[PDB]
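Quick one before lunch.
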Amino acid sequence: LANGTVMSGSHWGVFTATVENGRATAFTPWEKDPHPTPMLEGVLDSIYSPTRIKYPMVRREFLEKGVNADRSTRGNGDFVRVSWDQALDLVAAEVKRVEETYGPQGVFGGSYGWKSPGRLHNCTTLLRRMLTLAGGYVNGAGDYSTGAAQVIMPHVVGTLEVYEQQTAWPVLAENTEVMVFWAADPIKTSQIGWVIPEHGAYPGLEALKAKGTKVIVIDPVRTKTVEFFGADHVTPKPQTDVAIMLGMAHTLVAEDLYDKDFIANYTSGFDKFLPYLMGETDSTPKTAEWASDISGVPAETIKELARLFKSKRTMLAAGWSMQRMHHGEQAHWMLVTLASMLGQIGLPGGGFGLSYHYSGGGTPSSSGPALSGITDGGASVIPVARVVDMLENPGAEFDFNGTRSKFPDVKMAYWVGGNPFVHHQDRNRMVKAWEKLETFIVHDFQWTPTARHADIVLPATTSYERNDIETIGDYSNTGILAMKKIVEPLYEARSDYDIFAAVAERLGKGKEFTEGKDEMGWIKSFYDDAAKQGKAGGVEMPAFDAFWAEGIVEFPVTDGADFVRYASFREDPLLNPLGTPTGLIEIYSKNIEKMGYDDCPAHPTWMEPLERLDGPGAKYPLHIAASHPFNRLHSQLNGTVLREGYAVQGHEPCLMHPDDAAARGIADGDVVRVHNDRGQILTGVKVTDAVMKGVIQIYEGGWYDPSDVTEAGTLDKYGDVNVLSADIGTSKLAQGNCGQTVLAEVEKYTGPAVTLTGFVAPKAAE
Ligand SMILES: NC1=NC(=O)C2=N[C@H]3C(S)=C(S)[C@@H](COP(=O)(O)OP(=O)(O)OC[C@H]4O[C@@H](n5cnc6c(=O)[nH]c(N)nc65)[C@H](O)[C@@H]4O)O[C@H]3NC2=N1
Ligand SMILES: NC1=NC(=O)C2=N[C@H]3C(S)=C(S)[C@@H](COP(=O)(O)OP(=O)(O)OC[C@H]4O[C@@H](n5cnc6c(=O)[nH]c(N)nc65)[C@H](O)[C@@H]4O)O[C@H]3NC2=N1
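Model of the PGD complex:
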């Protein structure tokens, strides 16, 4: 057996693995990583944990009855182990049957998911490459991260904005006087990257602290971002940020402080927005006092913040939680409007930024080339979060960005690299709608709730059991890494590439799928490509084997540290207008006006959400800050040793304010039932004043562990927050998810003891 070290990467960073007798025994972070993630050891563990999928399995009821199977029992763990050949024969037969019987509209291939990095072993693209050869499929559009923001921004500033390079960190360090983190916790969220992360946000944050720059955080939770900076902390009732922003804008107009020149020369539609702000249209001036009545933030505080932002070089760095809510489009649209009134857009250190908390935005871009990877080669596309609406309403129409389409009639769903039975909203609704599917196939290397609900489960390998290549730095393009194989594939696990190649072979399309190339053949072609472009661009790169021997190639930064977003638009709006219909920032959109959507007006507007903390006639008393986990990447790593560090009596933790806990006779460490009209879950409480009164925090990603799959509304024993969320569109414009629009009640759990079954494999899978 092998003994030695091997370097590779992941969504958590670059690392060196120590291998002893063919087993990985430790992951040590890259010496050049400025801030490694404590989660790295959970990544190692995920390769060997009790929930690792060993063999290909088929649900017994499905094996026995096929389409006539009782579908209500999916998830009960009654699986039968089969050989790879029979499993592959079955999958290929089912794909062909559905394609022939129902056409491409019958196969849902959106397969949303974070998967693992890698240009070759991209499971979701490989799935689609195979389905394309099979006859076609229904795809998903957008994502769960910025579903609302990515649709509204192109109407306001002309581009998606959320996934674009930010004004460089060093520019902020030298110019910014006030840094505001609005609904953003960069310390927590910068641990991860879509491609390999360089953790560039930490050096930037540390430089701001060293400078003595003033930091203000607007978040209902006193996060580590607040603590690291000793920041001025404002806590609004969740879902009221728009009211606060209107109050600030009203103040700036009232005191005649706003930048009339910026407004006049760089925006369009402020004249149509002003009457609303003044209360002419509805007899309700949007004053700081009015904002206070809604948000709970003192009127004088709202006024002082506005005056401060107006007089200092201020950067508004906003997160995405506030748009993952009902009417989410309004949040960043109003933020940009407020930013316009301040008039600092395009100035070094001023304006706004929507990606400082994500994958290193702001970290200086190098002059390196882009790496390419394998490609894939009723409406045929639906907004990702409308997946259950589609299942329930085949043939019904839906609105999206000014167009109206019909839902296709789906009979099969194939999922890889994703965990919809954890990520999607309103679990109970989803569990029932899933019965409309004749066949559900899943590939994963961990027994997630999604894998447990499959008709056919195929064991995939992790990135550590294969070779790949990937970029370091979504925005910085720091370099290219050789993701070298660390250990041999465990049990009967196979790469998604091999599995799909075998299925395609059975469809008579093996050669079309593989292109006659093997793993290393594909990898070399991607590298050689980047190398051709590199040399043409003046960047020197080694030959393939030389690159592989060293394991990494880094690129030089030329002028990337000087980047200022919107500077050219500000310098000359005549030569460099924006990509909007007017060429200016659209505070009022004529196009959106023409759409006639009741839930998405033509300018930023405060609207009552479905449910909110202290809202009129609200039924439940507490808002659940269902945000991103500190110690998991969504659901990833829940089934590893890391869980021991945060579980409370074996359950997902629930942070609760001492006043809220006392009113209920709840003590620190108690197991509590969190419930509303949609569902009920058990969590373990940690009493802390970190969360504002009226708000509890239960992160998304907990592995749903239902008591009885056949019992409607069954209790989730572990703590999947999505058992409590509603499944509705942000509005007709974007149809984004509202995963953080959640109210619930909590009571100490005194019922019978439950046994956690989510972190051990199904008995038959052992
Ligand atoms: N550690 C970690 N785990 C992850 O799962 C993870 N996922 C990655 C992905 S895909 C994304 S998309 C990003 C997520 O980035 P995003 O900004 O969406 O993050 P969240 O954690 O949902 O929310 C950030 C903050 O918003 C606060 N907040 C919630 N409700 C409100 C509100 O109504 N008003 C205000 N002002 N603040 C509010 C929360 O309390 C939280 O501190 O993180 C990325 N990074 C990640 N890191
Ligand atoms: N209430 C709520 N609040 C939220 O803020 C929220 N965030 C949303 C966001 S922004 C996102 S992106 C989604 C995340 O939901 P997503 O489904 O992306 O979550 P992950 O836990 O990353 O699941 C990825 C799965 O891929 C598997 N996997 C890894 N690599 C491979 C591979 O190479 N082969 C195969 N076959 N499988 C692999 C992992 O083991 C894991 O089970 O949740 C969304 N849901 C949310 N709900």
